[PDB]
């Protein structure tokens, strides 16, 4: 996956992020909190925000659809996600990804790009 330098982590240290994580898991337990950021140098459009809440049963495939709309991409345009630095399967749900890969600050990080392979 791409070498990410998460703006969310640059701006907030672990303690501050974990405090937010605790608060989000407490107030919205029926939602999966995700931090979404673009791979460096990607030509894809930037997202207005990076903090999103998604249903636990939303699949990666349905997630791709929502993101494509937000960054004005067409179905035939290349779009790849990286979780835990690797590409997830489209049938996996957000709740499943969160259960297996949420960060210690209690957030699930997802990077997006138009490229599928990085050195």
């Amino acid at each position: 996956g791409p070498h990410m330098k998460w703006a969310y982590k640059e701006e907030n240290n672990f303690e501050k992020r974990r405090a937010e994580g605790d608060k989000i898991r407490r107030k919205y337990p029926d939602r999966i909190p995700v931090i979404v950021e673009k791979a460096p140098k990607s030509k894809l459009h930037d997202l207005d925000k990076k903090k999103y809440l998604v249903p636990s049963d939303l699949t990666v495939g349905q997630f791709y659809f929502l993101i494509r709309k937000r960054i004005q991409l067409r179905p035939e345009d290349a779009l790849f996600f990286f979780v835990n630095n690797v590409i997830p399967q489209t049938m996996t749900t957000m709740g499943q990804l969160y259960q297996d890969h949420h960060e210690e600050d209690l957030f699930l990080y997802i990077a997006y790009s138009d490229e599928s392979v990085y050195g």
């Binding site: 909190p33 995700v34 903090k51 999103y52 809440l53 998604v54 929502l66 937000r70």
Partner: peptide, 4 residues
């Protein structure tokens, strides 16, 4: 935070 907002719903995706």
């Amino acid at each position: 935070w907002e719903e995706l």
